[PDB]
């Protein structure tokens, strides 16, 4: 599927519901990263500085806050090609020296998708739109 103008609009509104104002954000981020580390326990080592061993710590919850804020900026920029590419390049440099595999970006991608679906319900979740538009985001964080 393709991340066209319509899919970007749907993803935008569905993200706003899942991400919310701030009250369910701690649970939202927890659900995502409990999934990431379950599917890929080996990924924990890259998060040594932010207590990847214990995602219940305030240290890691702040990291999950930053990750979600990064997704929020990209989703909000999905209708702004030029600015989105600039922000995606900034995220790319933030991960450049960390050796993040393409397999791991897909793991977090799936966790983000299970988390939004868990937050808004399988009844409305648009898997094709979300898969296509997160691909656009992750692929820009990997350079290409």
């Amino acid at each position: 599927s393709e991340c066209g103008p319509l899919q970007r609009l749907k993803v935008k509104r569905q993200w706003a519901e899942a991400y919310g104002s701030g009250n369910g954000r701690e649970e939202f981020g927890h659900f995502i990263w409990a999934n990431v580390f379950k599917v890929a326990p080996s990924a924990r080592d890259m998060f040594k500085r932010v207590r990847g061993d214990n995602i219940y710590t305030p240290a890691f919850r702040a990291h999950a806050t930053r990750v979600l804020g990064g997704l929020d900026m990209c989703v909000a920029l999905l209708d702004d090609e030029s600015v989105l590419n600039t922000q995606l390049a900034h995220l790319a440099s933030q991960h450049s020296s960390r050796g993040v595999s393409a397999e791991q970006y897909n793991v977090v991608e799936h966790a983000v998708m299970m988390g939004v679906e868990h937050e808004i319900g399988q009844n409305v979740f648009d898997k094709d739109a979300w898969q296509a538009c997160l691909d656009v985001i992750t692929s820009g964080i990997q350079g290409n």
């Binding site: 104002s21 930053r66 804020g69 922000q87």
Partner: protein, 149 residues
């Protein structure tokens, strides 16, 4: 007491949510750009601190992306006011991001604090400047721990 109270925290999140746009940068970009316009017109030597993100060209894609980052970081902090444990960690991360930069001091944050105090009533309904600044200062206090005056 001038302390950011639980009450003040609720009010700020209301002042912020009634202006924040959850889907489109149009409202975030406008607020942020307006804040730095105010900051630059009051602190002229500040523009050179953002040479890297084209501070002189407020409408560039580079500074648009920086404004979005600043507003995203403020949004995260305002939301984390409900969870001060995590908030304290996030404010430390922001502090080291503003550290090791000559010209970035505690005086610039007092200036941008006034910038927000002039921008926000123009876009926010039911704006409380007292309750806003008490918690805005609480936020900047963590962001300026190891900074010069």
């Amino acid at each position: 007491s001038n302390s950011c109270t639980t009450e003040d925290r609720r009010e700020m999140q209301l002042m912020w949510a009634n202006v924040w746009s959850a889907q489109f940068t149009g409202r975030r970009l406008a607020i942020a750009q307006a804040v730095f316009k105010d900051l630059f017109a009051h602190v002229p030597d500040a523009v050179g601190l953002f040479d890297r993100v084209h501070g002189t060209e407020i409408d560039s894609s580079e500074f648009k992306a920086h404004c979005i980052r600043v507003v995203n970081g403020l949004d995260s902090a305002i939301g984390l006011l409900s969870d001060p444990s995590t908030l304290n960690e996030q404010l430390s991360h922001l502090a080291t991001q503003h550290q090791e930069r000559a010209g970035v001091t505690k005086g610039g944050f007092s200036a941008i604090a006034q910038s927000f105090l002039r921008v926000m009533p123009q876009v926010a309904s039911c704006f409380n400047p007292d309750a806003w600044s008490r918690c805005f200062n609480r936020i900047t206090n963590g962001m300026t721990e190891g900074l010069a005056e």
